[PDB]
Write a protein that binds this ligand. Structure first.
Ligand SMILES: [Zn+2]
Lengths: 124, 245, 81, 97, 62, 217, 51
């Protein structure tokens, strides 16, 4: 895969003057980058099924031994207390403000890229 | 007859002619590790040097480094192999590292073999295709070998010399024994005056000699003091050793 | 624009998780000691004992016990009391 | 359905715009929404405690009762504070009941 | 309650296996990815003044 | 053999960038007297080769403890750092890492009646770093077990969905203790690894090599 | 060839069509930091695309 500017330079050099201005949208699109198209689902990967069966195999096994733990009704009522905060965190955390607050932790996303200021790289 | 069957098996199955018949698959693996165990064997290495010649143009960069430092340790110089090696380096110069090029050059510096296209593509790769602190991780006995290989061949690349001059400091020369530090300091100052390039880190290879001048002659310290006065007016000042504290 | 490239590869585990799970399991099964509530006996005792008498009552607590301390099995009535 | 694609879209519109804070009115009685969540939380605990107890009610409690008895039991196995005692009384009660 | 474990060495070695996997995973998988996109941004933001001035002096287009 | 592809600017990449750069900031490098140029660059690179990787170690212990502490707040799960050998086994391992670093600063030889009292207060750092993590994860979970037993005594005795102002005031006290446990889960993973940078950073000091010869003016 | 010259420069870099050809070297200076910022911040944002 050669570079697309040498593909632009070649495709503009071997056109004529009459069909130059018509060819400029098919030389533009021949050198556009590939953004791969949204394929069909094929949902829940072979590892997303291990992650959900293995988490269900863990939650059932932990609730099995919680139910015979000599404080079994206190153990099973702590999962209600612990899952009550997972519900209150979905309803109280500002998830767009948290997303943009983690973007400021990283200096790569806290600013814009900064090089190559367009007046230095002209070709007139 | 137990001793007879083992001795008959030993004289027809485990010899060095079948040791080089299993070594035909991957050459630069077996070339490198055997030569590190002390297996020089000049005409067993000729079987290597022709079994690998249809492969040198498509080797990875760690394979090319393994061929040259094996054929350096076995001291065997195949001139039509070593032009396929330098055509691997000068065609894939962006992929080589300074750790790998400083070992390939020291093979090419022993066996006095160079090209102008090779000397540019090694200097283009150390300077531009590699991290600028990769000379600092090198060890100054390998950088002085690279400095003289560019002064033997008369190749002035002033961008490469500013890169290799990073890797000369008190740190890099202090890791050398004083027999090897002396063989490096004289070898680095001889190359720095051949181009007339006196960087600001020449005052660490000069000061590696003037802090212990009892290992040097008066002929070699005349060589050192010739470079010190040549570097003093270039850098615009006078040399002064520092007592620490 | 690249959003549909990242939807193609779905879930994936962390890139060495099979060495964490094989390291935590190999610490929980290579204990070098009997399995927490059991005791190693001779082969002559294991071949002679029913599987209802090899079981201890402490190792089978009741799955949702109506009285705290209910066990599911009762084990050997041949106590050395 | 597609098993990952239906109820993901059903849970999405149960999560987001299904809101019993406004569909059941409920701004008439509650000041903010930050205190509707702060007692839907405590409401989830009180409902979950009362479901876990009632789903198996005749049980001798592992936790210390404070000197209280549930209903007309008061001397049975359900209120007996000695557990080896109440195991004997539960086994007698289970034949009858 | 549960204070001492059945083996203290088994729990100490579970901590050393978990924390050495996190050390391996950070050093090998996370931190190469962190620094590939931290230092694309950082090298471009540090060179931007000297890159553009070196490029201004080079292209003959003015 | 084929690595996965990462989107730039992902949220786990942004979080772990800020986390790593935080713990790296706790033991900053010291400015030399000289200006940093190509003369001083091998002395700066060698100054970094002799510093411990406390930026990496402290975010190893941050991320392995906050993941373990927050498991205790997931339903059906207990925190691994609520175990005595896990939590104190991380505390001794930080203390031994600091000591192995401080013992290598010499030639592995161990350092009148004063020094048994500097040693005791230093050897107690071993157990105090791990027991503070263990007791916090144990004492918060134990209080939650006792108060859930008390708060279950009221609906067991009284009616199900009846006499509800008695159980509402204790279900909101139970709910505010699980909320404090989310704060102690995040704080004790921070206090463990703030202190790991302090203990390991005590022996994180070497001599700047620097220029031994100069050409002044 | 002039039309083909500017065809390549506006297929790669189409934001160049916002600095008019007569007002171009009125922007320059001897250093790159001295270039007039009349079009610098506009050229940087037209270069980032239509979104
Ligand atoms: Zn619990």
């Amino acid at each position: 895969e050669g570079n697309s500017v040498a593909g632009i330079i070649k495709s503009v050099n071997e056109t004529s003057g009459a069909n130059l201005l018509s060819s400029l949208k098919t030389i533009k699109a021949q050198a556009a980058p590939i953004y791969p198209a949204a394929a069909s689902s094929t949902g829940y990967s072979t590892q997303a099924k291990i992650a959900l069966f293995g988490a269900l195999s863990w939650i059932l096994y932990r609730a099995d031994g919680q139910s015979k733990a000599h404080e079994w009704i206190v153990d099973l009522n702590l999962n209600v207390l612990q899952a009550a905060w997972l519900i209150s965190f979905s309803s109280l955390i500002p998830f767009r403000a948290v997303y943009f607050a983690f973007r400021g932790m990283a200096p790569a996303t806290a600013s814009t890229l900064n090089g190559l200021k367009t007046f230095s790289s002209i070709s007139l | 007859p137990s001793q007879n069957l083992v001795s008959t098996f030993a004289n027809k199955v485990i010899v060095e002619e079948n040791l080089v018949n299993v070594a035909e698959i991957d050459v630069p693996f077996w070339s490198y590790w055997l030569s590190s165990a002390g297996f020089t064997s000049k005409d067993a290495f000729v079987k290597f040097a022709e079994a690998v010649k249809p492969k040198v143009a498509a080797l990875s960069t760690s394979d090319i480094t393994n061929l040259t430092v094996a054929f350096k340790r076995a001291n065997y110089y195949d001139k039509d192999l070593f032009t396929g090696i330098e055509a691997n380096v000068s065609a894939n110069f962006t992929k080589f590292e300074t750790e790998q090029l400083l070992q390939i050059v020291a093979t090419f510096d022993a066996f006095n073999h160079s090209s102008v296209a090779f000397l540019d593509d090694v200097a283009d790769s150390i300077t531009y295709c590699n991290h600028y602190l990769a000379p600092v991780r090198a060890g100054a006995d390998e950088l002085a070998t690279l400095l003289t290989y560019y002064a033997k061949n008369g190749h002035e690349r002033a961008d490469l010399l500013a890169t290799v001059a990073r890797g000369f400091s008190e740190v890099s020369l202090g890791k050398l024994s004083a027999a090897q530090r002396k063989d490096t300091v004289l070898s680095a100052l001889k190359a720095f005056q051949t181009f007339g390039f006196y960087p600001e880190s020449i005052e660490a290879v000069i000061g590696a000699a003037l802090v212990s001048p009892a290992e040097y002659s008066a002929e070699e310290l005349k060589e050192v003091e010739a470079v010190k006065v040549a570097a003093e007016n270039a850098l615009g000042g006078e040399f002064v050793l520092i007592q620490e504290g | 624009s690249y959003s549909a490239y990242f939807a193609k590869a779905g879930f994936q585990f962390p890139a060495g998780l099979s060495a964490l799970v094989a390291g935590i399991v190999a610490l929980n099964v290579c204990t070098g000691r009997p399995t927490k509530g059991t005791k190693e006996i001779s082969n002559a005792e294991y071949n002679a004992t029913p599987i209802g008498y090899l079981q201890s009552p402490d190792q089978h607590p009741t799955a949702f016990p109506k009285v705290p301390g209910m066990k599911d099995v009762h084990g050997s009535p041949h106590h050395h009391h | 359905m597609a098993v990952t694609s239906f109820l993901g879209k059903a849970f999405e519109k149960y999560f987001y715009d299904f809101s019993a804070y406004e569909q059941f009115g409920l701004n008439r009685f509650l000041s903010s929404k930050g205190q509707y969540v702060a007692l839907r939380h405590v409401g989830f605990v009180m409902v979950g405690v009362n479901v876990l107890l009632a789903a198996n009610f005749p049980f001798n409690p592992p936790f210390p009762t404070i000197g209280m008895c549930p209903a007309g039991w008061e001397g049975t196995w359900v209120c007996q504070a000695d557990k080896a005692k109440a195991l004997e009384m539960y086994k007698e009660w289970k034949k009858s009941n | 309650m549960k204070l001492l474990p059945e083996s203290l060495q088994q729990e100490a070695a579970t901590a050393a296996v978990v924390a050495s996997w996190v050390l391996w995973h950070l050093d090998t998988q996370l931190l190469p990815t962190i620094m590939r996109e931290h230092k694309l941004h950082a090298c471009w933001a540090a060179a931007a003044k000297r890159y553009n001035e070196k490029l201004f002096k080079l292209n003959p287009s003015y | 053999s084929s690595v996965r592809d990462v989107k730039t600017g992902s949220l786990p990449t942004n979080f772990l960038t800020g986390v790593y750069r935080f713990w790296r900031s706790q033991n900053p490098a010291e400015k030399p007297h000289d200006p940093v140029n190509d003369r001083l660059l091998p002395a700066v690179v060698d100054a970094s080769d002799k510093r411990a990787s406390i930026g990496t170690w402290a975010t190893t212990f941050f991320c392995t403890i906050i993941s373990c502490n927050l498991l205790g707040l997931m339903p059906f799960n207990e925190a691994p750092t609520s175990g005595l050998g896990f939590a104190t086994g991380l505390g001794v391992s930080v203390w031994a890492t600091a000591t192995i670093l401080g013992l290598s600063k010499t030639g592995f030889k161990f350092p009148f009646i004063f020094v048994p009292l500097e040693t005791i207060s230093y050897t107690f750092r071993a157990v105090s770093l791990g027991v503070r993590l263990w007791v916090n994860m144990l004492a918060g979970h134990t209080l939650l077990h006792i108060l859930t037993g008390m708060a279950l005594a009221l609906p067991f005795s009284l009616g199900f969905f009846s006499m509800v102002p008695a159980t509402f005031g204790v279900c909101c006290l139970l709910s505010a203790l699980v909320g404090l446990e989310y704060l102690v889960a995040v704080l004790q993973s921070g206090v463990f690894s703030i202190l790991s940078t302090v203990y390991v950073g005590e022996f994180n000091h070497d001599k700047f090599i620097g220029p031994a010869a100069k050409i002044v003016k | 060839r002039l039309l083909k010259l500017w065809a390549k420069r506006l297929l790669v870099s189409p934001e160049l069509a916002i600095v008019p050809l007569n007002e171009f070297d009125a922007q320059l200076a001897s250093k790159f930091e001295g270039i007039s910022p009349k079009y610098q911040e506009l050229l940087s944002a037209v270069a980032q695309g239509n979104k």
